[PDB]
Amino acid sequence: DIQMTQSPSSLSASVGDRVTITCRASQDIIKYLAWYQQKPGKAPKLLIYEASNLQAGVPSRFSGSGSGTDFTLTISSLQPEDFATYYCQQYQSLPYTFGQGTKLEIT
C-alpha cells in the first residue's frame, strides 16, 4: 500500500494569508496526485488533478506542485470560503489512498 502523509494536521490562518500544505507519498507516484477540498457536512470536491492541473471553476489562488514523492498545495491568499479540510490522494496504484487531511481554520 502507498501511504500518504500530510502535514500539518491542522492550522489556523487569516483571510489573505498564503498557506502551504504538503503531502508525502511513501513510494514514487510520479504526478498521480489529486487535491480535494471537503467542507463540513459536504463531500470532497476535486481542486487539482495530476499534481498541478487546476480543475475548471477553481480559483487560481489554488495551486499544486511536486512530482515523485513530495507534493504541495498552496493557497496564495485565503478567502473566507476556503476554510475546510484538504486532502491529497494518490491514484497510481490501488487502493487509491488519501492523506489524513489538513483542517484549515480561521485565526
What does this structure look like?
It is classed as immune system. With 107 residues, this protein is an all-beta fold. Helices cover 0% and strands 50% of the residues. It contains no helices and ten strands. The N and C termini lie far apart (36 Å).
Features:
mainly beta; four-stranded antiparallel beta sheet; immune system; immunoglobulin kappa-chains; recombinant; monomeric; Ig kappa chain V-I region Rei
* Main sheet specs: 6 strands, mixed
Identify the CATH architecture.
Sandwich
Structurally, the number of domains stands at 1
Order of helices and strands: EEEEEEEEEE
Determine the N-to-C terminus distance. Answer: 36 Å
> Main sheet: which strands, in order across?
2-10-9-4-5-6
The chain-level structural class is mainly beta
Query: Which CATH class is shown?
Result: Mainly Beta
Q: Number of DSSP helices?
A: 0
Number of strands: 10
| Rg measurement, Å | 13 Å
CATH superfamily: Immunoglobulins
Shape: globular
